[PDB]
Amino acid sequence: LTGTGVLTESNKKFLPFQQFGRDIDDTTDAVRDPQTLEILDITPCSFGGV
Amino acid sequence: YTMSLGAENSVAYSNNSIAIPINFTISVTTEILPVSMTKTSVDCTMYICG
Numbered sequence: 001l002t003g004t005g006v007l008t009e010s011n012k013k014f015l016p017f018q019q020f021g022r023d024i025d026d027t028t029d030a031v032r033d034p035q036t037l038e039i040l041d042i043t044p045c046s047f048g049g050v
Numbered sequence: 051y052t053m054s055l056g057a058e059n060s061v062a063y064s065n066n067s068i069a070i071p072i073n074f075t076i077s078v079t080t081e082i083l084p085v086s087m088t089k090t091s092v093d094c095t096m097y098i099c100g
């Protein structure tokens with residue numbers, strides 16, 4: 001699963017079988033690292049209008 | 051059911067009778083009007099292509 005984002009620490013406690021996290025709009029905003037079983041929030045990069 | 055528009059009210063019309071109010075009610079009613087929406091901006095290039 002690929003993409004671009006800012007990976008921060010997450011307070012969301014996944015169940016052991018779950019790997020990715022989605023919001024209402026079915027976009028991946030939480031993920032589990034395969035090497036170390038920790039949860040990371042994926043905040044989208046700061047795109048904006050100039 | 052077949053809907054009923056309102057209760058029937060046969061007004062007691064005659065050529066020489068009038069109805070005069072002896073009292074009044076100060077009635078406050080609410081009217082809700084939308085004014086604005088959420089201002090949304092879309093990056094067309096990022097939405098189509100990322």
Ligand SMILES: *[C@@H]1O[C@H](CO)[C@@H](O[C@@H]2O[C@H](CO)[C@@H](O)[C@H](O)[C@H]2NC(C)=O)[C@H](O)[C@H]1NC(C)=O
Nearest residue numbers: 058059060061062063064067068069070071072
């Ligand atoms: C003014 O007078 C008329 C008739 O004298 C009244 O009308 C009647 O009202 C009763 C009450 O509901 C009805 O049962 C009758 O059928 C009505 N008659 C007619 C011919 O419409 C009227 O109510 C009176 N107005 C007031 C404010 O008292």
Ligand SMILES: *[C@@H]1O[C@H](CO)[C@@H](O[C@@H]2O[C@H](CO)[C@@H](O)[C@H](O)[C@H]2NC(C)=O)[C@H](O)[C@H]1NC(C)=O
Nearest residue numbers: 068069070071072073074075076077078079080
């Ligand atoms: C006109 O209507 C008002 C109510 O809208 C009447 O005021 C009421 O009067 C009774 C008896 O005097 C009291 O028990 C109520 O507490 C009053 N209500 C309020 C809200 O003050 C008034 O008396 C009426 N006047 C006439 C001439 O009919």
Ligand SMILES: *[C@@H]1O[C@H](CO)[C@@H](O)[C@H](O)[C@H]1NC(C)=O
Nearest residue numbers: 016032033034035036037038
């Ligand atoms: C995978 O390797 C990491 C290396 O730090 C280790 O901590 C972990 O226990 C290993 N196993 C799993 C299932 O992640």
